[PDB]
Amino acid sequence: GDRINTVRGPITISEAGFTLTHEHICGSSAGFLRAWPEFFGSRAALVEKAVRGLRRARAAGVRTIVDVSTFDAGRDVSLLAEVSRAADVHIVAATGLWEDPPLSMRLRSVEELTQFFLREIQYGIEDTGIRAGIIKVATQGKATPFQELVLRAAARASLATGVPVTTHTFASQRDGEQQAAIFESEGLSPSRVCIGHSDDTDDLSYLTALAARGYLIGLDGIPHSAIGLDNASASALLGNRSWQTRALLIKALIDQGYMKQILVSNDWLFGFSSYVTNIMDVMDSVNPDGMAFIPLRVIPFLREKGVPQETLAGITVTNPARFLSPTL
Amino acid sequence: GDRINTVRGPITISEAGFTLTHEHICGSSAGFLRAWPEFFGSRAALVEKAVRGLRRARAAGVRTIVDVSTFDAGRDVSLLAEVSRAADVHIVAATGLWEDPPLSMRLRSVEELTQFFLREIQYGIEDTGIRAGIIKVATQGKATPFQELVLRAAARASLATGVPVTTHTFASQRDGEQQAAIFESEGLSPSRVCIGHSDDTDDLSYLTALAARGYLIGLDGIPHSAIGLDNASASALLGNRSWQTRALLIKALIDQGYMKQILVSNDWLFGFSSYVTNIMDVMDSVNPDGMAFIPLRVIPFLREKGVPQETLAGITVTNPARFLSPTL
Ligand SMILES: C=C1OCCC(O)(O)O1
Ligand SMILES: C=C1OCCC(O)(O)O1
Ligand SMILES: [Zn+2]
Ligand SMILES: [Zn+2]
Ligand SMILES: [Zn+2]
Ligand SMILES: [Zn+2]
């Protein structure tokens, strides 16, 4: 209620501080880091890289990240706890399902999925006792039949616990509209939902249609850009819009009166096995600041564009605390 | 060379004894049993069910099973070792990839996949030190581009180590023909390959085309039948051919001179989360003998049809030892 669950236990709302609401320690697949740690060099190399990156983010002002890696994105909460302790940065873990559920998940009913999400929120993840503080869901265009069940189960789990829901979208296909429709059919308040990857589109009619009915808007991939990259795989993933173009959507929604509904993040990672080999090297070339990109480069950019510091503090501190605090 | 790796260490060829070459302790997905053990009631309930089933198979004469669950079928070698110790039945574990690889596998090259398979054969699975004694691969119709890489990587891993390859097929689509073509393009001897689920078809021209060029023929789902089952999901999985019809394919290949190339098994499981809920209950209703079905019902059936006991001993003891013994 007045506590947010992290990988090291409950924290008070004021302890969260400056919070990045959509990040990843390691974007992988279930069991993959355990079965093939050499893919990342070594598990120890991955830990060290993440600790260094989180320590640099902390020096830039970050106090909490929300790791929105699910079961099928290879979430390893023991890894998150280790890196969180070493870097002195709170990490909120996720339940839910992302874009790669295995058969043992894809065959389940809405009731079964709700049981699984509630397990990870209310009891713990695996045998770790670590509880999720957010529910992550995904569509990539029109929802599959199974994805409709996932979104409904996420709504039921959030209605039982007060934990918020955050989504992956194909933003240029306006996925958030169908996601909202399904969420609302289950009775979920839009104030409990962040429609993510919304900085992937420039369509203000789509974005304000979501914000007008009360959704939080996840402008969460600000440094994702392949401008300057011959590299087909990187351009497909990162897009050809500049980080400045994405960042100006923050100002656009402020100027329309939605400052309390904006969540900002990097959607960064320290390991990334669910895409092409060496993508992490390419991404780190594009954005050497990693997760510190938001405070080091986006915040000063918005200040120079005239956004008051108080407004940016509200977006990076107040909005995440309101979102993450469990409530109906 | 003269040792077969099991989940409890190396065993001599003569220790293997009566061997079921295609079985599963638990057909699941990577990480699923760890994240949601209540799906199986409890992990302890699954262990007890498997120990009881393996003890009954041992009483019927079974000494070894080959668990052909891969990474993506949720293979948990620690579970296999626990059940193997409690039941006093050797268990050979598998590497490879089955029909549900996650993104972190599906994006890999043939070289990367070969590294992963060799890791599990030569070094160990996860951090357990348990080494795989077989490589499992799968197609379901025409091979996907990725499945072609998997079959090539399996061939390269087998060529480096002498460990055999065993396959999942859509037998009525004659998948074994393309699998053989890819294997042979990499230089793999057919004597190192079992084309599995071959009892799913009655096409003798397909089966003898594989056997004539030297492949082992996996007649591995003998008790799979939905005769007597209204139940659409079970009929889709188990088929409408009787176990006697499947078993008579053993006699057919003996009568054509291929007795040394036949491998027989149940393709049974004690847990099964990668299909519809409660499928395990339906399967256990169909075949209460479980993994003991081959010795308790198929062997006497073939004897009554005139197959000499020496021939059946060759199929159930000699052929698996020759297949599993590492060699080029
Ligand atoms: C940049 C990434 O990595 C995986 C998670 C994602 O969907 O947010 O996309
Ligand atoms: C009966 C089953 O379970 C999963 C493995 C399979 O492909 O052999 O099919
Ligand atoms: Zn995403
Ligand atoms: Zn993400
Ligand atoms: Zn199979
Ligand atoms: Zn099988």
Numbering used by the authors:
A (entry chain A), B (entry chain A): 34 to 262, 264 to 362
What does the paper say about this structure?
The addition of ZnCl2 during expression, purification and crystallization resulted in the presence of two Zn2+ ions in the active sites of A53_2, A53_3 and A53_4, all three of which crystallized under different crystallization conditions. Apo structures of the octapeptide-tagged A53 variant were obtained using three different crystallization precipitants: AS with glycerol, PEG 6000 with MPD, and PAA, which resulted in crystal structures A53_2, A53_3 and A53_4, respectively. Interestingly, the crystal structure of A53_2 has a monomer in the asymmetric unit and the dimer is formed through a crystallographic twofold axis in space group P43212, as observed in the structures of several other PTEs: A53_5, C23_2, C23_3, C23_4, C23_5, C23M_1 and C23M_2. Notably, when AS and glycerol are used as precipitants, the binding of OP ligands displaces the cyclic compounds X3B or X3T initially observed in the apo structures. Indeed, in the PTE variants studied, OP hydrolysis products could only be observed in the active site when co-crystallization was the method adopted, and only in crystals obtained from AS and glycerol in space group P43212. The electron density in the active sites of the A53_5, C23_3 and C23M_2 structures co-crystallized with methylphosphonic acid clearly indicated that the ligand replaced the six-membered ring present in the apo structures (X3B in A53_2 and X3T in C23M_1), and two of the three O atoms of the OPs are in close contact with the two Zn2+ ions at similar interatomic distances of 1.9–2.0 Å.
